[PDB]
Design goal:
The PDB classes it as membrane protein. It contains 33 helices and 38 strands. The chain is of the alpha+beta class. Helix 11 packs antiparallel against helix 12 and helix 27 runs antiparallel to helix 30. The structure holds phosphoaminophosphonic acid-adenylate ester and magnesium ion.
């Protein structure tokens, strides 16, 4: 819509509210009320149209029903609210209401209120302001969000807010800095929930049963509806409370307001306000997004990204003030994001005095609900696709049930018309028959199953942010995995330093130098690079924190770490002091990390005094071989041999900028990234044996043997990824790597299929399609370079269908892989840890962030699913719960509808003969069905996954066929019992006990019990009926009650429900009929479950016969070893 210029807003219309007397649910019904009044009190129209006082009551009920329906249509439909309440008056200068309809599956539509001079409104707790130059409502624009990018001179010399009237203008404009989610009480939430259409339908059914003189049954179902809606309201309140726990509590911060330092809570924070950041306390990150002006902040973005590696946010005072701000470039580490824990504040411009507490100066950019964590919280709460939104499949199923209802009700209306019954009683019977089929809990059953799955998943420390991806986990075809941090533990051990003799020794046939010296016996330059090229920082308490790889190589180095970013070695191969002056941070797209430092290092055995400035860079060996001077002979073969064993290899390089002396202050030290990560020498290879997680192999073999495909997406080498995937059993056949034959600047021009042992070499033109022999008989590994060369070609859709290891991929390449896998129709799971997967975690159908730590807030916004533990077994469990979710939904979609259908036709078999159900009988039947529902609701899951897959859709052949077959069996037994009862006694108004009423009541009781016992899903996805002995005994108790009052063994139970005594031959025939009905229902359900319930695995997840034979042999061996 041009009125609101946002991508998530579909329609916007500037309404104007009308008075209450002009409302469309008031004025025409007030107009037509005296017509009915003149019909009623004035005679000669009493017999003209209505004819009776019961018809008068029917017309009064119909008019009141139409009035309350026209009132409720303004509440359960936004467009009908705009039609019936407010006139259009499409002009900006007089509008007061804005109808906002968002795009599909992006929250609930609303009629927002215009508040104003700045014209604004609030939709989904997002503030929209009217711009007259654009002539449209739009999202709030900050100083950062300006289209001309501001210079740093307005940020270094910001000096805080300097005007009181401008402070009040900022307060009225951007609002206060709070996570404004209002949790509702029980009263207003139940008031909103009592206006929902299925509550209205249930209350209308209660009134219909009350009109037919059913006191106890209507009271029971009203009490049950009240407590069920109370349960739903408490569930929604609990969910909103756990969402409210994600908010940062206010804590006193020192801001610079009116030229003075002032302590104030974090609820009052406006953009452009100068603030001082210190060490944050527990259960609090920082409030809102800031940019560092003066100081260095060691922060931890465990909220925005899954990993807990602390980054080193620098300042902007070293950058010139005339430079254009680059949020995605040099000043990426300049900003500080909200919700993130700052681990340290160190000082290593505007003339302002320093803060009383030793903190860094920052400027607020994005405050309130529009900060990045807050903008994710707004999407996760108000702008998400809700589980409780009524699907069209459930409504079409309800319409199918209503089609069956009308099929029964038309026949009972024709039979009552032909037999000349009372038309009001016949109409009430037909409306009762129609209304006894729609199950009011049916559209909300998926939400209940999702909530039960969330409560089950919270046991394994798995917290789900967006609960509409729980059914998606029931239909996952591809289960993508990261390698490092997901299938690999964080306790890395340094194997050592390799390739010291490159260009200067055991050599293989391909020339690979296998001499791996230890870190202590390494050279001086290798030791200085390992002491220089890291992002390690010592906290004020005295704990070294950083990358686990950098911590591992620090512990292998034997060098202590000082206070002012210095590292010393006391009298281990060399002795001296290094001090890092500038530090270029590591990026996943660059695959390197460099640092400029000052060295004073002496070798203990020869001397060789190395002083002065130094550049140490470590990274991926292909990038380093691209950016050094002279590539040594057999460079590629060394790292390919040390990667063929599965170890992770980095390259270390050094460059002396000034040699003897010093570089000179920080004026020269402000160099460029591309001007210092070039013309390098070679220092060595850092080889680390990254250890596999203990649960990785078991979880991946559980996923592969359960109709899921496991692929590996990782930024590491092809050989490490291939060796891990062979250990974890992702790749079974011979593998082929699609990569450049040489990773130099000239050799990166063609693509080659290569073997791991470097024996097969096949040239590939990327425009030509892939050879089908390679796709069919070989597993494939694809490098991100070869993926980038396959961006817009025909073979790419082949590659994503036949590759299970992706290596050397950028985060954008992981996003491209997951988008392409989404585009082919495969549902995707992505399990990731680092900041290289946050694009991938938000593009998969379900994304899990594996927080590597072993023993509501502190839940990351990087992924919709967050596993607090480090185990890989949290990945199948989610999928298991997802499958169970669908399975639970399926069983309720097979029970409730069938239950209602039975009840409807039972009423029909009564209402064909003029007899009605007893009040006590139908109340006892409803109580027993509620008892069986409570008995069947409590069921856990099995300890493993299965090859069968549940059907996601509800209109499949299995569910519809089973329901139709069981309904046909039930209606055949009901018709036969009715004909037998008419045969025994002829048919010739209060409730009087009869043989037909007792037989129909006993049949509907035993048929509801039979469809509870038959349609319960069992062994392939959950426990069986016999295993939950509480559930089995609860079903068997009602079974024994029904069969005891059917055998006439207890006359007290038969006289309690007003059941006539039965003839012995009739009793035997009816017991045989009940057994035949239960047996036929179980046979039909078992046949249709064995035939059509198993949703077939897709072609990417189908396994070859040798894999199935190996799986069967291993399962037989484990079953033998169990004995
Ligand atoms: N601290 C580091 N310093 C230098 N280079 C690094 C560092 N960490 C990773 N790299 C390199 O960056 C490359 C790709 O970046 P990245 O994807 O972040 O590593 P990764 O964690 O192994 N990928 P992944 O397995 O998906 O988590 C790796 O193959 C390493 O060579
Ligand atoms: Mg990772």
């Amino acid at each position: 819509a041009p009125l609101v210029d946002n991508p998530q807003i579909k329609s916007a219309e500037l309404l104007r509210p009308l008075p209450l007397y002009q409302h469309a649910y008031v004025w025409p019904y007030v107009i037509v009320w005296p017509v009915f009044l003149r019909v009623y009190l004035t005679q000669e129209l009493y017999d003209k149209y209505i004819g009776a006082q019961e018809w008068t009551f029917v017309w009064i009920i119909s008019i009141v029903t139409f009035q309350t329906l026209t009132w409720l249509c303004t509440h359960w439909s936004v467009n009908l609210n705009a039609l019936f309440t407010a006139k259009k008056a499409s002009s900006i200068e007089d509008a007061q209401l804005i109808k906002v309809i968002p795009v599909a599956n992006a929250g609930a539509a609303d009629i927002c209120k215009l508040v104003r001079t700045n014209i604004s409104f609030l939709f989904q707790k997002r503030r929209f302001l009217w711009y007259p130059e654009r002539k449209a409502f739009s999202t709030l624009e900050f100083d950062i969000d300006a289209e001309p990018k501001p210079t740093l001179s307005k940020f270094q010399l910001s000096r805080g807010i300097e005007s009181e009237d401008e402070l009040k203008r900022l307060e009225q404009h951007y609002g206060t800095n709070t996570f404004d989610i209002p949790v509702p009480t029980f009263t207003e939430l139940f008031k909103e929930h009592a206006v929902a259409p299925f509550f209205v339908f249930q209350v209308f059914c209660v009134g219909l049963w009350l009109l037919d003189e059913y006191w106890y049954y209507s009271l029971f179902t009203l009490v049950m509806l009240v407590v069920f809606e109370s349960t739903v309201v408490w569930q929604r309140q609990r969910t909103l409370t756990e969402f409210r726990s994600m908010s940062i509590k206010p804590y006193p911060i020192y801001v610079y307001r009116l030229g003075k330092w002032t302590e104030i809570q974090s609820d009052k924070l406006l953009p452009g306000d100068l603030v001082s950041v210190t060490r944050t306390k527990e259960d609090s990150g920082v409030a809102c997004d800031m940019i560092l002006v003066e100081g260095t902040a060691i922060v931890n973005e465990a909220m925005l990204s899954g990993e807990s590696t602390p980054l080193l946010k620098d300042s902007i005072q070293l950058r010139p003030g005339d430079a254009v701000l680059e949020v995605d470039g040099l000043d990426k580490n300049s900003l500080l994001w909200g919700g993130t824990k700052v681990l340290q504040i160190t000082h290593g411009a505007s003339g302002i005095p320093p803060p009383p507490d030793n903190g860094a100066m920052a400027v607020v950019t994005k405050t309130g609900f529009e900060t990045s964590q807050g903008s994710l919280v707004r999407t996760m709460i108000y702008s998400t696709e809700r589980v409780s939104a009524n699907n069209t499949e459930a409504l079409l199923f309800i319409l199918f049930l209503l089609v069956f209802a009308l099929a029964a009700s038309w026949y009972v209306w024709d039979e009552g018309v032909r037999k000349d019954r009372k038309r009001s009683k016949l109409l009430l019977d037909c409306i009762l028959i129609i209304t006894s089929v729609v199950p009011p809990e049916l559209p909300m059953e998926l939400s209940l199953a999702v909530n039960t799955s969330l409560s089950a998943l919270a046991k394994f420390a798995i917290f789900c942010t967006e609960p509409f991806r729980i059914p998606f986990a029931g239909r996952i075809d591809v289960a993508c995995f990261d390698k490092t941090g997901t299938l690999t533990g964080e306790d890395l051990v340094v194997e050592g330093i390799a390739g010291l003799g490159l260009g200067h020794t055991p050599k293989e046939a391909d020339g690979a130098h296998t001499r791996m010296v230890s870190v202590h016996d390494a050279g001086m330059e290798t030791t200085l690079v390992l002491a220089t090229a890291h992002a390690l920082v010592k906290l004020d308490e005295g704990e070294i924190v950083g990358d686990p790889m950098e911590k591992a190589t620090l512990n292998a180095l034997g060098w202590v770490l000082g206070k002012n970013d210095t590292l010393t070695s006391k009298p281990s191969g060399i002795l001296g002091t290094v001090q890092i002056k500038r530090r270029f941070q590591f990026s996943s797209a660059l695959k390197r990390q460099s640092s400029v430092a000052t060295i004073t290092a002496t070798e203990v055995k020869t001397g060789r005094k190395l002083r002065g400035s130094f550049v140490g860079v470590k990274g991926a060996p292909e990038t380093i071989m691209k950016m050094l001077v002279t590539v040594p002979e057999h460079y590629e073969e060394t790292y390919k041999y040390f990667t063929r064993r599965g170890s992770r290899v980095l390259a270390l390089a050094y460059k002396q900028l000034t040699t003897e002396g010093e570089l000179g202050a920080n004026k020269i030290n402000d160099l460029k990234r591309e001007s210092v990560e070039a013309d390098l020498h070679f220092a060595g290879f850092l080889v680390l044996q990254c250890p596999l997680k203990e649960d990785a192999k078991q979880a991946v073999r559980m996923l592969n043997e359960s109709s899921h495909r496991v692929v590996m997406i990782t930024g590491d080498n092809p050989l490490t990824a291939v060796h891990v995937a062979k250990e974890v059993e992702i790749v079974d056949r011979d593998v082929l790597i699609l990569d450049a034959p040489e990773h130099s600047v000239y050799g990166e021009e063609s693509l080659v299929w290569r073997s791991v042992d470097d024996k097969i070499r096949i040239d590939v033109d990327p425009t030509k399609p892939i050879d089908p022999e390679i796709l069919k008989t070989k597993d494939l590994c694809v490098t991100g370079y070869a993926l980038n060369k396959f961006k817009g070609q025909v073979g790419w859709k082949s590659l994503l269908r036949y590759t299970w290891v992706y290596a050397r991929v950028s985060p954008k390449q992981k996003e491209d892989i997951l988008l392409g896998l989404k585009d082919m129709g495969y549902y995707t799971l992505m399990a990731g840890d680092g900041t290289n997967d946050v694009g991938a975690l938000k593009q998969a159908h379900v994304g899990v962030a594996l927080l590597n730590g072993t023993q509501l807030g502190d839940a990351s916004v990087a992924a919709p699913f967050t596993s607090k533990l480090r185990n890989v077994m949290a990945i199948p469990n989610i999928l298991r719960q997802g499958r169970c979710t669908l399975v639970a939904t399926i069983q309720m979609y097979k029970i409730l509808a069938l239950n209602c259908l039975i009840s409807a036709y039972s009423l029909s078999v009564l209402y064909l003969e003029g007899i009605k159900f007893g009040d006590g009988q139908i109340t006892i039947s409803g109580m027993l069905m509620s008892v069986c529902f409570l008995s069947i609701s409590r069921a856990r899951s099995v300890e493993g996954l299965s090859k069968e897959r549940p059907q996601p859709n509800i209109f499949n052949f299995y569910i519809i066929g089973s329901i139709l077959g069981q309904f046909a069996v039930h209606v055949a037994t009901l018709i036969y019992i009715a004909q037998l009862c008419d045969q025994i006694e002829p048919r010739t108004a209060e409730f009087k006990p009869s043989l037909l009423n007792s037989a129909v009541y006993l049949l509907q009781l035993i048929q509801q019990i039979s469809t509870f016992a038959v349609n319960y899903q069992g062994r392939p996805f959950r426990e069986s009926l016999s295993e939950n002995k509480g559930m089995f005994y609860g079903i068997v108790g009602v079974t024994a009650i029904a069969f005891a009052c059917s055998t006439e063994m207890l006359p007290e139970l038969n006289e309690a429900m007003k059941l006539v005594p039965f003839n012995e031959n009739f009793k035997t025939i009816m017991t045989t009929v009940m057994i035949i009905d239960f047996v036929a229902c179980y046979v039909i359900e078992w046949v249709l479950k064995k035939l059509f319930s198993d949703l077939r695995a897709r072609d990417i997840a189908e396994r070859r016969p040798d894999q199935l034979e190996r799986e069967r042999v291993r399962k037989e061996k484990e079953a033998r070893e169990k004995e």
